[PDB]
Design goal:
Pathway (chain B): Protein modification; peptidyl-diphthamide biosynthesis
Largest sheet of chain A: 5 strands, mixed
EC number (chain B): 2.5.1.108
Strand order of the largest sheet of chain A: 2-1-3-4-14
Order of helices and strands of chain A: HEHEHEEHHEHEEHEEHEHEEHEHE
Number of strands of chain A: 14
Oligomer: homodimer
GO molecular function (chain B): 2-(3-amino-3-carboxypropyl)histidine synthase activity; 4 iron, 4 sulfur cluster binding; metal ion binding; transferase activity, transferring alkyl or aryl (other than methyl) groups
Family (chain B): Belongs to the DPH1/DPH2 family.
Strand content of chain A: 15-25%
Radius of gyration of chain A: 21 Å
Number of domains of chain A: 3
Bound molecules: 5'-deoxy-5'-methylthioadenosine, iron/sulfur cluster
Subunit structure (chain B): Homodimer.
Distance between the termini of chain A: 26 Å
Shape of chain A: flat
Chain lengths: ~350, ~325
């Protein structure tokens, strides 16, 4: 459950006959990746570690595995999203232990301000708590709405930084259970509904006001109203490649008398591009890169949605989401194995 | 200042193969030139994508990436071809420097005479097109000029790379190196065990190479590493840098000497990516220019062979190729494997 189940992982590997495996890992599970590796090697399975810092299941290292002759990939810390996989892949999601009900009870008076029918949302590390959160809220008199989400989502109620489809359901206001600010803000902007965030660790709460964020984006668009040369960036990460939408933005920019060039990268960062003559950039990939820029972009960097405001093709601010298709099943609360 | 990109020649080669969508990679210097070429190809009804990575060598063609985004051809700016399986037709565009090499030699005749009569002459890609003149000059000064063909990693006789000095493994009293920087002459010195004179064509300055300080600094890394139980052994998936068999051997050997070792797979080998891993020391088995330029000790395969005591003298790590059939043109080339 909350422990890396080294036994279950071995059993799946021995079932599909895996002899050589690659392990991806996010920054907080680097040490666990090497402990797993040593355990499988004791059990006669050669193990490579993937040296890149992985940021999501949108970026499986399956093609790299097939290159170094691995017959399977282990993806630590995230759950499957619908992608073609070139080697059989085991997803090992990370579940935080914290019980969320305590923070809900402490804040029930604020939660009432959301209204009778509420939408409840959290991130992957608290997804297993969602049933406990639901029972409690219903037991206090709420009707609880929880969206399934699309094929980029792994369980009902789960939000990603670039996908909030699980909140596009009937309901009067949105509850977010989790730490930090980016997800609740994305909820408010993507749904235009009252969003209430509760941190399960501190029990602190926050009503999300997107105005401050939206104004910072309006200034970004303003800095680019001066620009004539545009770079339009795609990432070739399997779950981030948006070729058609990027080509669309290039054609659109040219239709309005601006120069635009499509740029192919893997990891998207400004330093690699600063020798180029472009005056502003459009990231058509993970929107957390232009929207959550800590300060590294020294030229205006925009989302596709913001570009359409710039050219004057859209009046209201719309959050850039990467959307999937119908998801006919749900991922387990545990390890999963996928091959295509 | 380099010689200008030949836009007309490149476009004609693309039309000769009917290319409709091309990807262009460029190195740090040639970013403005990349987009200049893109606009010209586009104005000739050819869709062009730019590669946003900083390319660092023909050992890293972006041909897989081009195939992925639907391009039917790849333009590799600033480097000459090295023997590699290519997935899309690729056009190589060497950059050649305008600066006069012979003017630099003329300022330093006296220093060159100290090398010997029969001398080995080497340069980098940006001056290869003036290598014939430099040799004629030197032979007019009484030198016997010895120039090696080199192997399949090399594009022209007498060209050195940061990772391959095969053109210098020939008969001679000493090595002359024509180019800027100190890394190439350092490797030349360690790899050939001969006296090396470096002449910088842009400044006319010269330098007699003494590798001792560099070797001593390298042993401090080796010494540091002699206490480590846990090693990370790194490879790069770049087509010209992948050294999987050697990396595996290094793993097996570290384990035979009572040390733990893990193979690590990367594209760009950056230390900042590895900080969370539990390894006490690192071996880069890819482009040697990365360990030979951290926080934990990071070693080349030659250097870890010293730590384990299977090797005594210091050695530069090099990626060797095999025999080279023919030579690359002093201009644009087009290959498709
Ligand atoms: C937590 S996953 C999102 C984070 O990972 C990084 N990230 C995700 N996808 C990419 C990408 N394609 N290129 C560069 N950085 C990315 C971004 O900095 C973002 O803050
Ligand atoms: C310019 S020739 C090679 C240069 O690019 C960088 N480089 C080459 N290969 C790699 C690699 N595999 N990973 C990271 N940096 C590299 C090195 O720091 C060196 O300065
Ligand atoms: S927010 Fe961006 S980085 Fe995170 S899962 Fe979605 S696409 Fe991947
Ligand atoms: S391996 Fe190193 S020195 Fe050789 S071409 Fe690539 S980056 Fe240059």
């Amino acid at each position: 459950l909350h422990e890396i189940p080294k036994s279950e992982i071995l059993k799946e590997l021995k079932r599909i006959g895996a002899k050589r495996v690659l392990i991806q890992s996010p920054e907080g599970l680097r040490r666990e990746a090497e402990e797993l590796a040593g355990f499988l090697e004791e059990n006669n399975i050669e193990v490579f570690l993937h040296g890149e810092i992985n940021y999501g299941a949108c970026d499986p290292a399956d093609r790299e595995a097939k290159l170094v002759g691995c017959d399977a990939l282990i993806h630590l810390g995230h759950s499957y999203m619908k992608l073609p996989l070139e080697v059989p892949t085991i997803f090992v999601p990370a579940f935080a232990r914290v019980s969320v009900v305590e923070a809900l009870k402490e804040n029930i008076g604020e939660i009432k301000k959301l209204g009778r029918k509420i939408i409840v949302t959290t991130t992957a590390q608290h997804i297993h708590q969602l049933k406990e959160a639901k029972e409690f809220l219903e037991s206090e008199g709420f009707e609880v709405s929880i969206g399934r989400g699309d094929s980029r989502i792994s369980w009902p109620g789960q939000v990603l930084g670039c996908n909030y489809s699980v909140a596009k359901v009937r309901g009067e206001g949105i509850l977010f259970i989790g730490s930090g600010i980016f997800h609740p803000l994305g909820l408010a902007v993507a749904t235009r509904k009252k969003v209430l965030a509760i941190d399960p660790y501190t029990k602190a709460f926050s009503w999300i006001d997107p105005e401050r964020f939206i104004r910072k984006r309006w200034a970004q668009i303003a800095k680019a109203m001066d620009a004539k040369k545009f770079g339009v960036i795609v990432s070739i990460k399997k779950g981030q490649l948006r070729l058609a939408e990027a080509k669309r933005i290039v054609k659109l920019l040219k239709k309005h008398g601006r120069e635009a060039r499509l740029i192919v990268m893997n990891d998207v960062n400004y330093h690699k591009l600063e020798g180029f003559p472009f005056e502003a950039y459009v990231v058509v990939a993970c929107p957390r890169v232009p929207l959550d820029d800590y300060g590294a972009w020294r030229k205006p960097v925009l989302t596709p949605k913001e570009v359409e405001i710039l050219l004057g093709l859209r009046e209201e601010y719309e959050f850039d989401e990467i959307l999937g298709g119908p998801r006919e099943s749900d991922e387990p609360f545990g390890i999963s194995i996928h091959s295509t």
